[PDB]
Amino acid sequence: DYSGEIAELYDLVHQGKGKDYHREAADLAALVRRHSPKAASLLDVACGTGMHLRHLADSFGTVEGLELSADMLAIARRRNPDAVLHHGDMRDFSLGRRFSAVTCMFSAIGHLAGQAELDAALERFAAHVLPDGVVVVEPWWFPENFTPGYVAAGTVEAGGTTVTRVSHSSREGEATRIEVHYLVAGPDRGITHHEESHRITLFTREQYERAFTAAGLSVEFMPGGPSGRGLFTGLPG
């Protein structure tokens, strides 16, 4: 879940971590146009708080989003008041139109539980992409590149609020268990503590490739990517 204070802190936490959604969006837009020169529309699946979408809207005449968390989607709609942002589930949704690109960024795909859900999501992405368009999926880490025991800590301040965030990652079967704690402080607020836990699936490279292929997409992996985890692209046909 991405509800409540988690959702409210998300953008500030990733700004403090230095995530550059503007540069990621410009790179994404150029990648789409590389494959589809007259591309004019984009669907961002698991769009979160709509940071990519806000920048992509400066580049594509139609951008839409899909998000399962109502609290994340509320922030996305406020950020993107002129865009249609849909509530729904990447495993099983139907918008009744296709787009030049279908994107799923920042390892959101790792919230799927196993091969059947991964295959289902990829088939939905293929069902929403145009024939000269592109499906873009930023994976979670592969098992061979996952670092168990990893601790990340950072602090950011904005508007009078100080937020400290610490994460810890461990191996739990075929998933990463990530525990995240926050201290949120301010002159009137005092200090409040928050915590959450995620299980993010460690799909192998071959499992992603299998899901793309079963959806009718030809698949390519590029290492590095916006987060060090690489990027998969898929073209219909």
Ligand X SMILES: Cc1cn([C@H]2C[C@H](O)[C@@H](COP(=O)(O)OP(=O)(O)Oc3ccccc3)O2)c(=O)[nH]c1=O
| Distance, CA of 64 to CA of 44 (rounded, Å) | 6
| Distance, CA of 40 to CA of 22 (rounded, Å) | 18
| Distance, CA of 77 to CA of 98 (rounded, Å) | 21
| Distance, CA of 230 to CA of 211 (rounded, Å) | 17
Judge contact between 191 and 184, C-beta under 8 A.
yes
| Distance, CA of 135 to CA of 38 (rounded, Å) | 16
Establish if 38 lies at the interface with a second copy (CB under 8 A): no
Q: Which of residues 128-157 bind a second copy (CB under 8 A)?
A: 148-151, 153, 155
10 assigned ligand-binding residue:
yes
Q: Which stretch binds ligand X (CB under 6 A): 31-39, 115-123, 172-180, 215-223?
A: 172-180
Q: Which stretch binds a second copy (CB under 8 A): 17-25, 32-40, 129-137, 160-168?
A: 160-168
To the nearest whole angstrom, how small is the minimum distance from the Cβ of residue 232 to ligand SAH? 15
Taking phi over 0 as left and psi of -120 to 50 as alpha, with beta for the rest, 210 belongs to alpha
Judge contact between 199 and 176, C-beta under 8 A.
yes
Q: Which has the closest alpha carbon to 55: 104, 86, 21?
A: 21
Task: Pick one of ligand X, ligand SAH, a second copy, none as the site partner of residue 94 (Cβ within 5 to 8 A by kind).
Answer: none
Establish if 91 lies at the interface with ligand SAH (CB under 6 A): yes
Establish if 140 lies at the interface with ligand SAH (CB under 6 A): no
CA-based angle 170:69:108, to the nearest 5?
Answer: 45
Q: Among residues 198 and 210, whose Cβ is nearest to a second copy?
A: 198
Task: Pick one of ligand SAH, a second copy, ligand X, none as the site partner of residue 155 (Cβ within 5 to 8 A by kind).
Answer: a second copy
Q: Which has the closest alpha carbon to 102: 153, 52, 140?
A: 52
Among 170, 172, 204, 220, contact with a second copy (rule: CB under 8 A): 170
Q: Which residue type does 22 have?
A: H
Q: Which of residues 149-208 bind Cl ion (CB under 5 A)?
A: 186-189
To the nearest whole angstrom, how small is the minimum distance from the Cβ of residue 100 to ligand X? 27
Establish if 56 lies at the interface with ligand SAH (CB under 6 A): no
Q: By CB under 6 A, name the binding residues for ligand X.
A: 141, 145-147, 150, 152, 167, 169, 176, 178, 180, 198, 200, 228
Q: By CB under 6 A, name the binding residues for ligand SAH.
A: 2, 46-48, 51-52, 66-69, 72, 89-91, 105-106, 108, 111
* Residue stretches of the annotated binding site for S-adenosyl-L-methionine: 2, 10, 21, 46-47, 67, 89-90, 105
